[PDB]
Design a protein around this ligand. Structure first.
Ligand code: ATP
Ligand code: ADP
Ligand code: ADP
Lengths: 68, 68, 308, 1223, 66
């Protein structure tokens, strides 16, 4: 719920702009944290994508995360 | 008047004045320091003072040629 | 005395305006500009112009056959046409893209908005006078009253100096972007055509005789359009109360090899702003009578070129 | 061969030299450094060059297991060593600090912290001693953690020690003109001779070497004492000065420095006191040959004034010829000096001395000819710089109109003082008056009229030492206070060049400081109080202030009215130009002086006015003096030919380089009008280089020699030979970088090596370029460009470094290099650090063209202009042809081209505006199109290169038609495309004619399997998911043709002129990310990855730096990145949107351009500066939005690299959404 | 003498004969000291009417051989 009160300079608009476009903040989530948070999610992946309930991969978890 | 009188504006003030006064008082004091008697109050050759008040004291501000 | 006059006017002109402040666009103006842009002349394509300048040229038809590069005035013709076209293209393009934002479509520019505001007011936009460093072209006050008028006159004379290709009499010095090149080209012409070698370039010096006559080739040029300030041509006298800026008669030039204080020396300023820049050349004006030259020097005479 | 190349290098590199230099054994442990490490570093560099050279070649199967490990170790050991040695320097500064008892007591805490670091450091040293070999020593892992934390703590220790540094600076003046850490190094001598022998330059004016004689005192170790002083210029040429009074080293550094200064002053005084008798006793030649330069000039002046005086009184007694006899004596002296000492002489210093005398004597006799003054009191005699060496009170005294002051006795040796025009007399009188009233002159005018040099010369003649600095916007008042304190304490003169370009409030407080000192000096008070500085401080009278401000540019403020009071103005608008020339020609020793002077003046004037107006032209005094200092040698050569010939040759051949194509005829037609006697002369041609150039031009594969290259490269050689630095102005794709590279090669071939560094100034912030004071922790950071400077200008090297800036020329960053590019050739910082230039180094700019340059930077450096027609696109095509006859040389070069030559030369210019084509959305120069079509055609034929199959002529003609259909057709709309198509029908090789049912040539493609023109889009529906994303995208025609074009370029393996980079153009909402993402899904993430990014207006270079660093996550240059070994792609939606600066040059894309062109960039992690990360593998793709009008455009220099083509709307949208409705 | 073999000019002979730079500049060409230029700074591969100079030197050389 950003409004005119929630802008004090341009820069906020830049960060939100890229949030609309990509959603990956450079090294906000990758400060040695992306892997612990992603590891807290693969249990859902075991049924969600359902790779025959066998296995998964590593980068594809980030792909599913940006998707979510 | 404007450009008829001076090509651009110049900021003459008193600093140049008492500079010139300090010069010419030195000149007269050290002229008459050797004068044991004044024919009619002085024996000055006032052409150097012309050159000084022309080109040195007031010459600082002047950026044009014609103004010289 | 007449100096007084101008001062008071500008003084009065601001004073009321001060108190005048204390009291409690995108319309047919762009259509007026739209009608304007179909009145300035067309471009001159260089593929045609290089041809035309190469086809015909000489100082004197008897002296030489037609030729291009070699004669200074032809290369000057090419340089002047080049800069003129450089300005013409810019004006046509920006008028277009100023009107092609509303009637046309494009994401609005700040420069174009400034251009709109300038078009409504008297002052032309900065886009046609200056650049980040400096690109002074023809800075005059009005939008079209004199600015485009001056540019039109320049292009008219330049075209007739080209399309016919014949050298006319009574050159207009104000039109040329670089007057000094005109004069030095005249020098080179005299050295080559005459006394060639008997006369060296560094030996030649300069002088002028004022054609004291109303009603009227040899070496030198005929200049039209200079303006004096504060006396007559010859038998110089005190100016009357009105008519501060007076015409200048035909000051035909003269050049001579060197050596082969009653005289007074005047400057020649392009614009009436009067700086070190715009000093094209200096002219000796012997017409003294009883008043010694220093009288005139303090009186600040000059032979300016434009009148604004 | 290659196995030998690895074997013997391994045999040597395992068995390396291990010789190290120990500081001393003065405790249990020993601390050491490698004084051979230059050999280590350099031989390492070409080692890794050799190893990469091998690995890149095809036939290097086995070495990968071995070589990588080897390179890895080498790479790794380097940075460890570097960190270590840097820490050593820190420790090597701080040891003598904590040896003293009082300072260690007064701050116990960090003294014990230093006890702790001493323990840890000794442990590291003993581990290294145990190892005996530096490579296992570096291999230790524990070390690496300690080293940077130790570094940070030692920075903290220095931040403790500033409080003592201020007092130590107080105890001796000159240290105010020295920065902090170099002051620490100066104070940690640890030796009499060695430590300070490399620092005499930046602590006195002109001294560089001093002998050290050990006097063996009884039971004390022999003390080294100074006995003579030396000024070295060049290599062997020098000036020596004995001393009778000696100077002895001691225990306190301030003491022997002070004694050095004093005893210098005293012996200079006494030698002069003698020399003033010898001048009139011995006679002219003997004392001029015997004495040094400074004393000789003093002697000449004093002789002339005394004799002229004597003549004037003798006139006063009665009408006498004796005044005329004295004038005649001077005239006689002229011939004897001029005849012999000028033409023949040994050595540079001795040479400079003579003409320094000659110029003075010329002016001397010129004055004495017209000197119609009746007596001493006359003004005409009381207008020049007279001198009197008073005997009754033994002292010099120099005199002006009224002012007087004593000579300040500073040894300068031979300096190239300058001519005396009347304008210099106006300055001399003005400055003498202002100093008599206790002010500071502040001359003003346009650029290059002799302001700074006039100030410096009035300093030199009065015997004082001047200290030029260079203010800039990154200054702070503390450093100005430091300077002014040094000035008042010492007795020296300051000349704050470019004083105006400085912050406003800093000027506000400087007003106070200078007013305080003015009032202090006015009273004649020995001791005074300085603002902001609590301790009381003394004064010496003979000080002065000068600012050479520059009225009116971009980035120039005004002086608030508090500060205009102090300084008196001196208007220097138009320098004289004739008298200086004529007296310089006299100084060299010419005979046709007066005519030639007029020739110079008139020629340069006419050239200035009536020639075409271009921004980069310059004809000021810098150019003229360059010509003069050139012209000395030519007369010094044996030829007695007529001078005017030599001079025409010199002028013409100097000024040719800058001129654009058109102005050359006008220039030499103008030459003919002034020297009609002379017809022509050949250009003096240097045989070695001209024979050498074709050799390496043939050595390369893809290089065609043409005469224009000979001309331009030789001109570059000459301007290199004369001037400091230079610029290569010229449009894109014109061969500038190649010219520089080949020149460096030829110079290196005949010995005398040459190295080149590159930089991009507007892809880093100027604050980082020159470094600032940190805005958080109150502590300095190093600057990149200054780090390269310090690393480069060390003596005792063999390179000849050429620092290349490469970008635009914006005034703000460049203009604070005026001092380095001026005759001062000294760099000055806001740190307070001053670094002296050497002849080892040159500065070059590979800039396109100036549009934001004042003449103060145009006239400082020489220049060379490349033109578009010097290297036509055709020559580039022939170079590619030379490559095709390298390996695929069966017949292909001939066959391919037999269409290409006529099919390209006589066609390309009939598309620009023959037919209308009036919407080329991307305005370009057509060389880019040629590079494009060549890069496309190589990918077209790559398949049949792969299978080693050679085809007929007709198929090749079809291929060329296909290639160049796009890549000149990629920038047009359907209407222009059909007109294009009709052209190709009229006058070109066959296009599809089988059906052509209202379908353009673009619609079809040539098939590899057979000579056919077909096209289709394969059927494919969706997966079962129903999310709109799961209905991602469908197989369109537009997408398929886009993949078709893209894939060709993207398969090509990094050929020259191929960056492997692409770029689309299409309206906002014309299937950009659609087609790109369709491509991107088809990647194989097992050996091919991908990355996304977007652009907005306020995205800065630091942001792009961050995202690319996070993308790679490794420095793949130093044998790293297993996970980035797969190939990656960087995709950007819109390169236009970044904010164009006001000038017109946007500052974000430049980082990208240095990334594409060269790969890598400079780091900014507050730890090390001069070094760059390297990208050994990457890929690049972009997308535009129909530039023009409201939409921005990219820098034109960057357009040369990306494949560009349109992305039209589909016109088939009934057939895109059909399937989803079917399902 | 012979136009086929004896007339065959060596690069030294060619360079000296060009270095004579006698005439032929009816259009107007600049110094032959380094390079000829047609109009505006445009290098010319050769002196414009070189052939007449070749013929003149061949005539003189035939007289010398006589
Ligand atoms: N002797 C040569 N023969 C054939 N091709 C050449 C030769 N010299 C240069 N080239 C080609 O010219 C191009 C050189 O462009 P260069 O990189 O020099 O441009 P530049 O002048 O440095 O300007 P920018 O740095 O902006 O590109 C390359 O494509 C190169 O292959
Ligand atoms: N009277 C002179 N005699 C000799 N050289 C001069 C004279 N005037 C100017 N110069 C030359 O001009 C250059 C100095 O210009 P400078 O004063 O640095 O320009 P700026 O004042 O714009 O910094 C030097 O090469 C210097 O020798
Ligand atoms: N092949 C396709 N199949 C289905 N939808 C498509 C296809 N191509 C384009 N579109 C739709 O058209 C739109 C075009 O938007 P896009 O090209 O991303 O904007 P821009 O051109 O500014 O990048 C997309 O949002 C997409 O939904």
């Amino acid at each position: 719920l950003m409004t005119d009160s929630e802008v004090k300079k341009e820069e906020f608009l830049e960060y939100i702009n890229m949030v609309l476009s990509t959603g990956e903040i450079p090294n906000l989530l990758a400060k040695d944290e992306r892997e612990v948070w992603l590891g807290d999610i693969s249990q859902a992946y075991c049924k969600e994508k359902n790779l025959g309930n066998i296995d998964p991969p590593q980068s594809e978890l980030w792909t599913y995360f940006v998707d979510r | 008047f404007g450009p008829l009188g001076w090509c651009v504006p110049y900021e003459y003030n008193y600093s140049d004045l008492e500079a010139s006064l300090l010069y010419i008082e030195k000149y007269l004091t050290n002229l008459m320091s050797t004068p044991q008697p004044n024919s009619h109050n002085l024996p000055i050759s006032m052409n150097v003072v012309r050159y000084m008040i022309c080109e040195v004291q007031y010459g600082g501000r002047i950026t044009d040629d014609l103004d010289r | 005395s007449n100096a007084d006059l101008t001062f008071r006017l500008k003084e009065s002109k601001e004073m009321i305006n001060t108190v005048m402040e204390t009291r409690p666009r995108e319309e047919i103006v762009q259509d007026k500009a739209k009608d304007m842009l179909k009145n300035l002349p067309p471009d001159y394509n260089d593929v045609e112009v290089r041809e035309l300048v190469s086809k015909l040229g000489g100082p004197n038809p008897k002296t030489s056959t037609e030729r291009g590069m070699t004669v200074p005035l032809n290369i000057f013709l090419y340089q002047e046409v080049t800069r003129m076209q450089r300005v013409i293209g810019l004006v046509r393009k920006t008028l277009q893209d100023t009107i092609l934002a509303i009637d046309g479509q494009i994401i609005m520019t700040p420069e174009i908005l400034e251009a709109i505001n300038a078009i409504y007011d008297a002052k032309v936009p900065n886009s046609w006078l200056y650049d980040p460093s400096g690109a002074e072209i023809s800075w005059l006050l009005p939008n079209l009253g004199s600015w485009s008028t001056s540019l039109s006159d320049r292009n008219k004379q330049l075209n007739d100096w080209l399309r016919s290709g014949q050298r006319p009499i009574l050159f207009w010095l104000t039109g040329f972007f670089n007057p000094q090149g005109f004069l030095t080209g005249m020098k080179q012409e005299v050295t080559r055509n005459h006394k060639k070698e008997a006369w060296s370039l560094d030996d030649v010096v300069y002088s002028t005789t004022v054609k004291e006559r109303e009603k009227e080739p040899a070496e030198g040029v005929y200049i039209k359009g200079l303006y004096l300030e504060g006396c007559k041509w010859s038998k110089n006298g005190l100016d009357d109360s009105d008519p501060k800026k007076i015409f200048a008669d035909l000051p035909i030039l003269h050049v001579s090899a060197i050596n082969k204080s009653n005289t007074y020396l005047c400057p020649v300023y392009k614009y009436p702003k009067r700086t070190d820049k715009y000093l094209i050349f200096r002219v000796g004006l012997p017409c003294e009578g009883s008043n010694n030259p220093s009288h005139w020097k303090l009186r600040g005479v000059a032979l300016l070129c434009s009148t604004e | 061969k290659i196995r030998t190349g690895l074997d013997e290098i391994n045999l040597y590199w395992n068995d390396m030299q291990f010789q190290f230099g120990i500081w001393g054994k003065r405790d249990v442990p020993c601390m050491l450094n490698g004084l051979i490490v230059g050999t280590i570093l350099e031989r390492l560099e070409e080692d890794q060059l050799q190893l990469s050279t091998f690995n890149s070649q095809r036939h290097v199967t086995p070495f990968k297991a071995e070589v990588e490990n080897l390179i890895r170790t080498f790479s790794d050991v380097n940075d460890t060593l570097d960190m270590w040695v840097k820490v050593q320097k820190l420790w090597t500064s701080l040891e003598p600090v904590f040896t003293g008892g009082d300072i260690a007591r007064q701050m116990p805490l960090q003294a014990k912290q230093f006890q702790g670091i001493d323990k840890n450091w000794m442990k590291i040293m003993e581990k290294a001693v145990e190892t005996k070999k530096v490579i296992p020593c570096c291999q230790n892992d524990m070390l690496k953690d300690f080293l940077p934390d130790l570094n940070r703590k030692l920075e903290d220790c220095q931040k403790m020690l500033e409080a003592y540094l201020e007092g130590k600076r107080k105890k001796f003046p000159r240290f105010y003109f020295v920065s902090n850490p170099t002051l620490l190094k100066i104070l940690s001598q640890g030796s009499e001779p060695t430590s300070i022998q490399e620092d005499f330059e930046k602590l006195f004016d002109a001294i560089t070497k001093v002998t050290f004689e050990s006097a063996k005192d009884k039971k004390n170790p022999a003390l080294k004492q100074i006995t003579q002083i030396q000024q070295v210029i060049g290599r062997n040429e020098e000036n020596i000065s004995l001393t009778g009074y000696y100077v002895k080293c001691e225990g306190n550094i301030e003491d022997w420095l002070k004694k050095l200064e004093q005893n210098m002053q005293q012996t200079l005084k006494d030698i002069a006191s003698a020399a003033a008798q010898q001048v009139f006793q011995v006679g002219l030649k003997e004392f001029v040959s015997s004495q040094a330069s400074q004393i000789a000039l003093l002697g000449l002046q004093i002789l002339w004034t005394s004799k002229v005086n004597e003549g004037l009184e003798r006139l006063s007694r009665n009408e006498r010829n004796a005044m005329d006899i004295k004038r005649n004596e001077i005239k006689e002296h002229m011939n004897i000096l001029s005849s012999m000492c000028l033409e023949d002489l040994n050595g540079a210093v001795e040479r400079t001395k003579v003409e320094t005398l000659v110029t003075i004597q010329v002016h001397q006799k010129d004055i004495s000819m017209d000197l119609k003054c009746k007596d001493v009191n006359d003004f005409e005699w009381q207008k020049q710089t007279r001198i009197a060496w008073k005997t009754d009170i033994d002292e010099c005294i120099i005199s002006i109109t009224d002012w007087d002051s004593p000579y300040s006795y500073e040894f300068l040796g031979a300096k190239e003082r300058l001519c005396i025009t009347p304008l210099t007399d106006r300055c001399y009188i003005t400055l003498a008056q202002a100093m008599s009233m206790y002010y500071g002159g502040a001359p003003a005018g346009p650029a290059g009229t002799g302001k700074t040099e006039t100030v410096k010369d009035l300093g030199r003649t009065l015997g004082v030492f001047v200290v030029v600095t260079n203010c800039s916007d990154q200054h702070r008042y503390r450093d100005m206070a430091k300077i002014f304190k040094g000035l008042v304490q010492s007795g020296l003169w300051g000349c704050f060049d470019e004083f105006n370009r400085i912050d406003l409030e800093v000027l506000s407080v400087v007003a106070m400081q200078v007013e305080s000192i003015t009032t202090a000096r006015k009273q004649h008070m020995k001791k005074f109080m300085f603002p902001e500085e609590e301790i009381e401080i003394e004064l010496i009278p003979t000080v002065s202030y000068f600012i050479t401000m520059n009225p009116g540019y971009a980035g120039r403020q005004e002086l608030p009215e508090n500060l205009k009071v102090l300084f008196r103005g001196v208007s220097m608008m138009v320098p004289d130009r004739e008298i200086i020339i004529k007296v310089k020609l006299a100084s060299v020793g010419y005979l046709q002086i007066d005519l030639l002077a007029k020739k110079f003046n008139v020629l340069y004037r006419l050239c200035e006015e009536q020639l075409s107006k271009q921004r980069h032209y310059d004809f000021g005094l810098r150019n003229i003096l360059s010509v003069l200092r050139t012209a000395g040698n030519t007369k010094r050569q044996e030829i007695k030919s007529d001078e005017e010939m030599l001079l025409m040759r010199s002028l013409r051949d100097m000024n040719l380089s800058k001129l654009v194509a058109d102005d050359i005829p006008l220039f030499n037609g103008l030459l003919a009008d002034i020297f009609p006697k002379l017809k022509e002369v050949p250009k003096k041609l240097y045989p070695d280089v001209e024979k050498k150039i074709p050799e390496e031009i043939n050595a390369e594969s893809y290089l065609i020699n043409t005469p224009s290259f000979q001309l331009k490269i030789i001109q570059l050689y000459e301007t290199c030979l004369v001037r400091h630095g230079f610029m290569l102005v010229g449009p894109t794709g014109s061969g500038k970088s190649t010219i520089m590279k080949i020149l460096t090669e030829v110079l290196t071939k005949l010995g005398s090596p040459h190295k080149i560094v590159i930089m991009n100034p507007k892809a880093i912030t100027a604050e980082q370029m020159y470094g600032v004071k940190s805005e958080i922790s109150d502590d300095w950071i190093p600057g990149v460009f200054s780090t390269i400077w310090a690393k480069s200008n060390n003596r005792a090297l063999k390179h000849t470094t050429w620092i290349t800036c490469d970008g635009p020329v914006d005034a703000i960053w460049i203009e604070n290099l005026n001092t380095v590019l001026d005759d001062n050739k000294i760099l000055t910082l806001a740190n307070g650090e001053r670094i002296a230039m050497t002849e080892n180094c040159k500065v070059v700019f590979e800039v396109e063209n100036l549009n934001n340059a004042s003449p103060a930077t145009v006239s400082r450096c020489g220049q060379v202009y490349v033109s578009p027609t010097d290297l036509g696109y055709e020559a580039v095509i022939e170079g590619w042809i030379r490559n095709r006859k390298a390996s695929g040389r069966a017949e292909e070069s001939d066959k391919l081209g037999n269409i290409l030559r006529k099919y390209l030369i006589n066609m390309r210019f009939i598309e620009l505006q023959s037919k209308e084509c009036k919407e080329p959305m991307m305005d370009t120069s057509p060389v880019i199109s040629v590079i494009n079509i060549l890069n496309l055609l190589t990918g077209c034929l790559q398949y049949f290169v792969q299978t080693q199959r050679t085809l007929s002529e007709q198929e090749y003609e079809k291929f060329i038609v296909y290639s160049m259909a796009w890549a000149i057709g990629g920038i047009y709309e359907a209407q222009d495309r059909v007109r294009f198509h009709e052209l190709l029908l009229a006058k070109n090789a066959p296009i599809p004619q089988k059906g052509k049912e209202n379908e353009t040539v673009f619609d079809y493609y040539v098939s590899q399997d057979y000579l056919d023109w077909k096209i289709c889009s394969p059927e494919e529906w969706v997966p079962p998911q129903s999310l709109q994303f799961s209905q991602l995208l469908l197989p369109t025609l537009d997408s398929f043709r886009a993949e078709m074009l893209l894939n060709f370029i993207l398969t090509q393996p990094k050929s020259h002129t191929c960056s492997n980079s692409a770029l689309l153009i299409g309206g906002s909402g014309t299937a950009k990310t659609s087609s790109v993402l369709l491509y991107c899904n088809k990647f194989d993430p097992q050996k091919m990855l991908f990355k996304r990014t977007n652009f907005s207006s306020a995205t800065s270079p630091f942001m792009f730096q961050s995202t690319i660093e996070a993308e790679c996550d490794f420095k793949v240059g130093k044998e790293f990145a297993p996970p980035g070994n797969k190939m990656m792609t960087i995709f950007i939606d819109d390169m236009s949107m970044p904010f164009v600066n006001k000038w017109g040059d946007q500052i974000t894309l430049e980082l990208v351009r240095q990334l594409i062109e060269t790969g890598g960039f400079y780091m900014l992690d507050k730890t090390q500066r001069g070094n760059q990360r390297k990208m050994k593998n990457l890929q690049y793709i972009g997308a535009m939005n129909h530039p023009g009008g409201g939409r921005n455009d990219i820098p034109n220099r960057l357009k040369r690299q990306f494949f560009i083509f349109n992305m039209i709307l589909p016109l088939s949208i009934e057939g895109i959404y059909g399937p989803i409705i079917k399902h | 003498k012979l136009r086929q073999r004896k007339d065959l000019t060596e690069e030294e002979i060619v360079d000296i004969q060009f270095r004579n730079r006698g005439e032929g500049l009816e259009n107007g060409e600049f110094y032959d000291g380094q390079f000829w230029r047609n109009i505006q700074g445009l290098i010319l591969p050769h002196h414009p009417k070189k052939d007449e100079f070749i013929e003149e030197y061949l005539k003189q050389e035939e007289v010398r051989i006589n």
